[PDB]
DNA sequence: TCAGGATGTATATATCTGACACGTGCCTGGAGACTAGGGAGTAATCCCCTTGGCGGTTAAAACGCGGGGGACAGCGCGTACGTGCGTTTAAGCGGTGCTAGAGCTGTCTACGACCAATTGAGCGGCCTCGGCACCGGGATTCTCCA
DNA sequence: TGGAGAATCCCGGTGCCGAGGCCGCTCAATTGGTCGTAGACAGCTCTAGCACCGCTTAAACGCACGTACGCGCTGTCCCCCGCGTTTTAACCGCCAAGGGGATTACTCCCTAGTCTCCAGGCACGTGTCAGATATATACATCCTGA
């Protein structure tokens, strides 16, 4: 058993080292013609647009967690908690 | 030389809203400032939707659309809804 | 005949002509119709009458008859949807609101 | 006799790489201002000033790194000073042919430059006051290792950093002294050094109460004549404004002789560097020829072909000196026993190299010298402990004593200084400072330019002085009036000749007229010479060997304008430190 | 004919999913009350571009949402994205 | 025994003070001159308008109370009331400035 | 002319008045110099566009326009300036 | 549709920096957009200079000031210099 | 009679008047001068030499022969100005900089 | 501190493919030549607005010194978060079938550019008085040691 | 918990200077034509988006267990605030010079519009080797132990 957090470090250099989606496709295709049933009824969408909407998404979260990432270290931690997401879109201008 | 300005438009507007209120210079420099703004915001956004649609003109379509692009929730609900007032009111006169 | 301006047919008080040629000399489009200098002068004059209003009732609530900077920016940064429009521009002489975090407060 | 016994390479002939000057060599008049033209500048804050940088190149290791690539531009900048006045600073300097106006730097050069040199020169002033007065913590303290003062510790939040030094100074400096230019000169003509002030001596004491002792150890005394300062409101070191403005507050003069006198207290009371100058120069050796306080490498005082010609003569000498050597009776019959391990190598490597030496030609004969000093090193070790052709900026003796600015002697004349930078122990990656053999190695891949300004600040040209300028020193006229009644106060005796490539061409141009020999002794060296330069010197058979080393200096000063001008064009290009990545992206794209 | 009404898809952004993303940010340990802020910052990112996606396809008078009007609202956005055309 | 208010009701009363007022916090000789000496790198013997000296006054003290504001907000954050330099270089760099 | 040290006119107390008007409460002793550092940052960035607006129009007067065009370019719209 | 892109030019380019360096499908459809991105923010911002100064032409002037105030530094001072170096070649000759 | 390029005349590889069409049809202006195209051209090609030589550089150091977008990404984000020129952009399948917090790091 | 065992990792060989590189027709768009006319460049002028001085005043900045309170470090606990393992689920991949709607073409008319005549709305000039800034003196409130 | 002193509010009075109204006088908006083509509109082809089914199997999920991290408490001491006193330079009101920005009248050459011609670039076919996968190997790291 390793000490917990050796397998976090090697989980942080594996998903840096590549660039794969991190999200299933199917669920997050199903968001997105959820979130846009309000807008629209019967609704298409291109193949090719719901990739775009999916890399949009995740480079998107990916930059929010380094900034929260920033914001814990700041208070003297290393867990991340909602109040350091809500600092940075606060700051950001976002909220 | 001469200088155009959106003042007296500014003013009129504030005598039917305020009757008995005035305004400073600053105030209506300011009040000018935001006039030209919102103007070339709207345009632009309208110039790139004709562009995007191989349009070469600049319809109501693309005010429209430009406002709501712009302008958040109800305040592009009442934009939309007194620009359509004017047209409706010019055309058919 | 006797002239009537384009901006008394459609009831406004902002210049359909005088954006018409705003709009012609922008360099838009090639092409501009005759609905969009009164679909946006129309615009303009609710976004102003509504900035103005909200500017008047700052303005009343500290018992004066000129509308200063100061008022404008009250108006503008007590309102979701004006603070959202405007949310990158600074108003000249206009101040900030008045806001004092709590845990700064004496207890 | 013996063996052909050794030939004594005598010290006196054959010294070490360092001859001297012997500081009187002029004993006659030669105080003629001959040399002049119209690239000469009387500049009386020269000394000073080359004073400042000998002093910083000897003290490396106690100054930041920014102050140790400096130049006499970046002195003159920093501190606004122009040349020309012989009372002074001549304000302003005039441009172009005709000038109403004068240049006046701010009109002149880019405006960061001229605040940067400032800034130096305000971090150089407080280093000096940091190593005099933080001594009460006597050199070694919490800020140890470093240098006492950097661009921070300049730049910080104490917003008088120079007060409280300033105090301490204006304490201490009333008892150590003040420059000449800061004593309260005598208006009332009659107390002279060797005089008194008052007769304090109301009568001489002639009827003594006992006849027993007539003598008297008071035959007539004074009041004493102790020369004073200047009063505490225009003594400048008390105004006010060197708190929070710096040095930059008082005359340009006044900061010169500000810096001198603060140098002086630095080498006097720094007990760090007063102690290590005492170290560096007595300590258990006598110089390889004896006492003497100034010295110069041997290729500067003679020259290249006249040094490498008598070492050629001395090379083939020892070379049989050696042979002698090896093969003697007593010194054979105490070899077999190991006598010493330097008297076998030696002896068996020379043995080896006769037969592959006499097997060269005499054509050959000067070309083994250059090409062989290197495995000739280690052959002296029982003659001298360096090559009589040796570096001189390796020693540790020939250290305090020495200048190397200077470049070269000339009779009736005088001597050339060239004020260059910092070579000792730091920046010796391309220093010019070095030995014969690689400077004039160096100098010719420049003359070839191999190596070009992107190299050149890529080796250490950032530490390296950028820029310079030659000067001519009149020691005849100086040797002189010390030598007869001391004519001096305020008296010049620096010239500038050449500040940039231009100038320094001009001067080759001008000095290769003086290396012209006196054909006009066998008359009837330009024209209209009795009015703007006196080229033909007085025809005779004095200046000779004068002209012999008047054509070595012009070899040397036409080997330098490669590397100078190279310099020259390396600051502009590259003045502040950039990505030059990008600078050959250039190249490799176009 | 078949135009169904979903509900509830949020919960198909997966915990390990979120745990996936902040890895590659950088994140060494994660709070449990992260993954419903997570969820809500991801739902008003969606809204917000395809609000004005679907806008650019009503002006276009099209009923499928292409790949440009996406790139489209992401620049309007300030979100510039390459590697999709325009 | 002199009358003395504890430490920080006089910052409350000069937050309120200044957040209530308008004009502008910076003396205008020396801003003005801050701004001649900056673009002396640019370009040799620029004149400025009033306005401009101004506007640039205006936009400057805009841009410091809104990254002040940011600052306090990470100040809070970290459990604290003093601002440190460690506050600003959080702010800056959450904002995309550094 | 050369001007310098002009940044020390950024007076300690002018900093805490803005530093008030943000609603900081207690100011470390260290925050002056950098926020001075930050100031320079900012004008050096409008300012040099500003100029560049001057230079292209050919003038030698740093108008007030080219001083609201920089910061419009800059993401940082000034109202009241024309 | 002979739809248009800056395919072999890139391609062109690249033979030139590493002769023997090839490149994805998609590799190039991130350049094409980098190039499109940049040509559209050059050429936007000449524009506003051009309406500024009351000028109805865009000349290299304004493309060098424009590129003066979109680039970063070194960036803006090597790109003036190629787009001074390539004029210059093109009038010269 | 012999067409000879524009762009050749420049010494250019990007097309000077593919440039110039798309100057004259965007509404950029009412007109285009004649050395415009040309300057933009080499701006142009300019930055994509810049940006494809960092790229290389990148694809050769992970003993691959062909770029995609992983090293464009890193070509980028690797230097300080084409950082600040491309700094509100996402690449597609670029992924991020390998870059770990210090204190995260294990001691 | 040195080390051994287990594990994840950098290393080395084999094969397997499909994505990139290489190679023909054609057609559209770039080049050449040419003319016109207006945008842009130049010279002359004038006036206003920016820079620089001067002296008085006083508000703000600087400096110094308690001392109170907040930043910070150290410690202890307890619960939430990571890690592992078996069981369940649904993503992914392929294949099949269908039709909505994207995308292109061809007609043709209604709308916008353009232009000359006419005029009336809005701009610059010029007064004038009232809203607001300021002051001074009294009222009320707020903060801090009891 | 109640009072003493400092801050702030308030009411009346006074003065000024800018907001707001009036008045010519352009010159930009409006009206009524003609002229061309941009886009509305109908119609057709065929791509690709949608739905569904089946089988693999990797990822998601649930639960168990343990320890590491977060958070609360305490104590220390340094460092910023509050206030007094000295000093300095900002500000104001006035004055003067002169540089540079704006206006005006010519002049000319550069760019648009047009027509003709042909080849550069793009769509469409083909090969093969760079990279991914597999599979077998020594190397470095982690965790526990002496």
Redesign the pocket.
């Known amino acids: 058993?390793?000490?917990?957090?050796?397998?976090?470090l090697?989980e942080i250099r594996?998903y840096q080292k590549s660039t794969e989606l991190l999200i299933?496709?199917?669920?997050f295709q199903r968001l997105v013609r959820e979130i846009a049933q309000d807008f629209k009824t019967?609704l298409?969408?291109?193949?090719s647009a719901v990739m775009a909407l999916q890399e949009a998404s995740e480079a998107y979260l990916v930059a929010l967690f380094e900034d929260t990432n920033l914001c814990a270290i700041h208070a003297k931690?290393?867990?991340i908690?909602p109040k350091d997401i809500q600092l940075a879109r606060r700051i950001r201008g976002e909220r | 030389?001469?200088?155009?300005?959106y003042?007296?438009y500014v003013?009129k507007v504030l005598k039917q809203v305020h009757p008995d209120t005035?305004?400073?210079?600053k105030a209506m420099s300011i009040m000018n400032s935001f006039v030209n703004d919102v103007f070339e915001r709207i345009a632009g956004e309208a110039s790139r939707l004709a562009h995007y649609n191989k349009?070469?003109?600049i319809?109501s379509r693309e005010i429209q659309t430009a406002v709501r692009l712009l302008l958040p929730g109800e305040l592009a609900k009442h934009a939309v809804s007194e620009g359509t007032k004017a047209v409706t009111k010019y055309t058919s006169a | 005949?006797?002239?009537?301006?384009?901006?008394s047919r459609a009831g406004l008080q902002f210049?359909?002509?005088?954006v018409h040629?705003l709009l012609?000399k922008g360099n838009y489009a090639e092409?501009?119709?005759?609905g969009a200098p009164v679909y946006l002068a129309a615009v303009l004059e609710y976004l102003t009458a509504e900035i103005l209003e909200l500017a008047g009732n700052a303005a009343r609530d500290n018992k004066?008859?000129?509308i200063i900077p100061r008022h404008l920016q009250l108006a503008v940064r007590n309102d979701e949807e004006l603070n959202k429009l405007l949310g990158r521009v600074t108003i000249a002489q206009g101040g900030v609101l008045p806001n004092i975090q709590s845990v700064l407060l004496p207890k | 006799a013996h063996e052909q016994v050794e030939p004594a390479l005598i010290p006196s002939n054959w010294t070490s790489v360092i001859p001297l000057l012997t500081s009187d060599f002029k004993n006659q008049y030669s105080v003629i201002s001959r040399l002049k033209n119209p690239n000469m500048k009387p500049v009386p804050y020269a000394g000073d000033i080359i004073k400042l940088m000998a002093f910083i190149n000897k003290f490396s290791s106690f100054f930041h790194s920014d102050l140790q690539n400096l130049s006499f531009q970046d002195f003159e900048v920093g501190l606004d000073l122009y040349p020309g006045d012989p009372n002074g600073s001549a304000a302003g300097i005039v441009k172009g042919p005709e000038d109403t106006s004068l240049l006046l730097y701010p009109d002149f050069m880019a405006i960061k430059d001229i605040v940067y040199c400032q800034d130096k020169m305000n971090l150089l002033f407080l280093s000096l006051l940091d190593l005099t007065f933080t001594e009460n913590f006597d050199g070694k303290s919490a800020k140890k290792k470093g240098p006492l003062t950097t661009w921070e510790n300049l730049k910080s939040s104490s917003?008088?950093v120079f007060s409280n030094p300033l105090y301490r100074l204006r304490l201490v400096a009333r008892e150590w002294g003040y420059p000449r230019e800061w004593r309260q000169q005598l208006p009332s003509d009659q107390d002279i050094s060797k005089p008194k002030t008052a007769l304090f001596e109301q009568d001489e004491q002639t009827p003594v109460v006992d006849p027993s002792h007539p003598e008297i150890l008071t035959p007539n005394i004074y009041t004493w004549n102790a020369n004073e300062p200047l009063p505490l409101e225009s003594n400048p070191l008390y105004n006010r404004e060197m708190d929070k403005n710096g040095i930059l507050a008082l005359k340009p003069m006044d900061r010169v002789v500000l810096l001198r006198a603060l140098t002086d207290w630095c080498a006097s009371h720094s007990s760090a560097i007063h102690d290590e100058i005492y170290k560096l120069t007595h300590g258990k050796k006598d110089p390889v020829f004896g006492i003497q306080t100034q010295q110069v490498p041997r290729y500067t005082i003679e020259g290249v072909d006249n040094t490498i010609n008598q070492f050629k003569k001395l090379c083939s000498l020892i070379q049989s000196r050696y042979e002698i050597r090896s093969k003697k009776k007593h010194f054979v019959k105490q070899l077999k026993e190991g006598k010493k391990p330097d008297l076998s190598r030696k002896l068996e490597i020379l043995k080896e190299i006769k037969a592959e030496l006499k097997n060269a030609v005499k054509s050959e004969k000067d070309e083994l010298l250059f090409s062989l000093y290197d495995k000739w090193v280690p052959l002296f070790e029982g003659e001298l402990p360096d090559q009589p052709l040796a570096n001189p900026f390796s020693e540790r003796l020939y250290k305090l004593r020495l200048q190397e600015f200077f470049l070269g002697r000339v009779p009736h004349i005088g001597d050339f200084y060239m004020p260059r930078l910092h070579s000792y122990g730091d920046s010796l990656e391309m220093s010019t400072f070095t030995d014969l053999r690689n400077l004039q190695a160096l100098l010719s891949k420049f003359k070839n330019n191999e190596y070009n300004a992107f190299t050149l600040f890529e080796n250490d040209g950032q530490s390296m002085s950028a820029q310079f300028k030659l000067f001519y020193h009149d020691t005849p006229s100086l040797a002189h009036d010390v030598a007869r009644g001391r004519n001096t106060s305020g008296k010049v005796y620096w010239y500038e000749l050449c500040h940039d490539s231009a100038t320094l061409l001009e001067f080759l141009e001008f000095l290769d007229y003086k290396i012209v020999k006196p054909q006009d002794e066998k008359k009837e060296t330009t024209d209209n010479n009795p009015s703007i330069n006196t080229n033909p010197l007085p025809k005779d058979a004095k200046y000779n060997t004068a002209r012999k080393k008047l054509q070595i200096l012009k070899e040397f000063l036409s080997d330098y304008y490669f590397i100078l001008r190279q310099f020259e064009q390396m600051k502009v290009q590259f003045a502040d430190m950039k990505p030059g990545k990008r600078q050959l992206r250039r190249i490799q794209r176009q | 004919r078949?135009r169904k009404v979903l509900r509830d898809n949020i919960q198909?952004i997966?915990?390990?999913?979120i745990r996936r993303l902040a890895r590659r940010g950088g994140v060494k340990?994660?709070?449990?009350?992260i993954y419903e802020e997570t969820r809500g910052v991801l739902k008003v990112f969606l809204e917000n571009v395809i609000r004005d996606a679907v806008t650019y396809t009503e002006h276009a008078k099209?009923?499928?949402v292409t790949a440009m009007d996406v790139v489209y609202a992401l620049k309007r956005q300030g979100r510039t994205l390459y590697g999709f055309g325009g």
């Open positions: 058993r390793y000490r917990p957090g050796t397998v976090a090697r594996r299933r496709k199917l669920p019967d298409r969408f291109q193949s931690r290393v867990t908690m | 030389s001469r200088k155009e300005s003042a007296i003013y005035g305004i400073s210079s349009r070469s003109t319809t | 005949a006797k002239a009537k301006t384009r901006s210049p359909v002509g005088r040629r012609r092409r501009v119709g005759a004066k008859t000129r | 917003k008088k | 078949h198909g997966t915990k390990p999913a340990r994660i709070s449990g009350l099209r009923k499928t």
